[PDB]
Amino acid sequence: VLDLGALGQDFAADPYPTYARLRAEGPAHRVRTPEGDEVWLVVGYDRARAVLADPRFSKDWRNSTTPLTEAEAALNHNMLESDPPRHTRLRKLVAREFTMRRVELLRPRVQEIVDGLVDAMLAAPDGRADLMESLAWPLPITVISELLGVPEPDRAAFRVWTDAFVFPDDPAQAQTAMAEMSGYLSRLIDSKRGQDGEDLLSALVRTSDEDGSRLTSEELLGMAHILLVAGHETTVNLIANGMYALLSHPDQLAALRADMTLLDGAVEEMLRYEGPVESATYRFPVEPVDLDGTVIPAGDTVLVVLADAHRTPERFPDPHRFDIRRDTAGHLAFGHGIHFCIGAPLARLEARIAVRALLERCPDLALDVSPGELVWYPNPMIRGLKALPIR
Template sequence: MTDGFAEQETEFDLSDTGFITDPEAGERWLSEPRPVCRGRFADGTPIWVVTRYDDVRAVLSDPRFTSRPPGDSHLTSMLSRGIPQDVVEIFDSTLLTMDGPDHARVRRLVTPALSARRMRRLEPVVEHIAHDLLDALADDAEPDLIAQYAHPLAIVVICDLLGVDERYREQWREWSESLAVALRPDPEQVAPAVRGMAGVIRELVEQRRARPQDDLISELVRVRDTDGDRLSDDELLALAMVLVQAGHDTVRNLICLGVFTFLGNPAQRELVRSGATTINAAVAELVRYAAPVKHAFRRFATDPVRLGEVTVQPGEAVQVVLAAANRDPEQFADPGELDVTTRSCPHLGFGHGAHYCLGANLAQIEAEVALTALFDRFPGVHLAVPPAEVEPRFLAPMPRLPVRLA
């Protein structure tokens, strides 16, 4: 058994750009869930890497692991990378950095607004947006489904949900792209993006406070102003920005990975088309198999915690790899194969426990609609380039997805 960080070779190294983009390294971490081992985070600090399904669930459900590093190290780290103080303060108010009573309070206030029932009411809106985007693709000889379909669909839907005015949407899209590089944020892009989003949200808050509408900002303002457990102003701002990322980056990745995966597995796509399985089950399997979210945010031990053969000491960081847990052969039969029929074991693609993804219901619905609309409208759609040119890398997003529609 091992106590503290083991003196062993570091195989999982997020500080190495080559590792992030290396398909072979990624495949090893997807296909070989292993005991807890040593790794390195993007800033070079050591982490324990957790890849087995049961170990990942244990970390994500154990209150002895917190989202906040010890002391002020997370604030110091962001400031040292040039992130301005005012931006750091907003980031420090997000659900991603909260635990315990504060996390439970904020989550309890916002969860009803993002319930599965409420998100299902958005389905006709998502369908309308998807069909408009597909209309625009019809005359394009070789459209890029990321830039022209997955990306705009995701940003328009989340803006509609929040109530962001149409005149801001192109700018909002640029800001959200700046925030998507969470491992290595660029202060020159992140700071103006956060300030810009915060400015728009503050403006919307004042407008909705005066004239409430049927959107999420209005609901959050109501919660902020009338409920006993109120949101602070920074919490409201931070929550809206987290929802933008959850409702944009993850959804975009899920749609384009779903298209790519279905194009490589036509028999599985036919099971959906024929009604042998549901699109709901198929998207759940795509989340497991294609892994639009590869890993959760780091957790930090507050007490000594035994994980397999390792004791994680207080203050040490743990990185769970959701993508690998979802390929664990101890939990999934033939985990490297796509199987769109209902699997008996739930995937961990949206996390688990208190920090389960708030946007999971929205992501599921948007992917169902986007994939159904695309393949119904263009059943002969196929890649315009060899698959190897656009094949997803482990921790690098697909840059493009050029197709021919017939």
């Protein structure tokens, strides 16, 4: 047992040793998260990678001996929290809207938002600004909002809720933020029906209305929620976490500026080295699972620590080395198996474009604060900074 909460900001800023110390003992460990959830952690690449796809580990709450709260039960009917055949049917509804080829068509607009964002930051008569506030946050929400059909003004709200799901001002703020969001979503869905809108939310509504067995109303709400939540802090932290590593490793920042053909690889290294998903979402085994002699009971919550698999020397030689030229093949930053991130092409698209943009423009690009003054979130599921001042 370990109370990651008790560990404090020290564990949050650098949780890797802890996960590593555990990986040296066994492949699974019962811990208590900063908020207070008692779960099992799966560490070590091979085991992490295997568990992720393993059919034995279900993502359907019906298989969790720890039941959903009321607020959460309004949102669990989504592809990420289901197993086939439901997962299969639900992902097929949006699969075509997220392929590399369809996403690429968004380049002009994505490239467009970044330029504007970067032009404003540079206007800073201080040569100093927060890259989190100026680019990392604005971009993700703007892109997804236009795609689905979430009004510009309602986007702040999501910043607040998403904040609460990761770190609530109390074990209640999370549950209340879910409720508020679940109510916003439903109302927005209502406002869309019969309006002949062309945005993706409008399409999904029509589909639900065409065949409720194809997409139930509780799945229509679940779908909307998952497409807007699953990629929010994740994409935002990929960008903040990616620029930071590069900024904290000038050797690599110089490498990319000098050779832009390293872009896609450097982003892959970012995902690897400091991806925003520290631990994958809840899995619940359908039956007892002996792992190296460690048996997790059926129905227990399990978090696969992607961060620890990404620092497993065996798989990634010299894992603590941020190297934008390293063979990343195999990283699990976007997951592994049937649940592989559907938004990966778009996320990559946004990160790749914003990264280059900054490297090109920003002449004397550098961290404008001591790493020690940086603050991270305790949550073992998401790796992200509260701020990232640059100059």
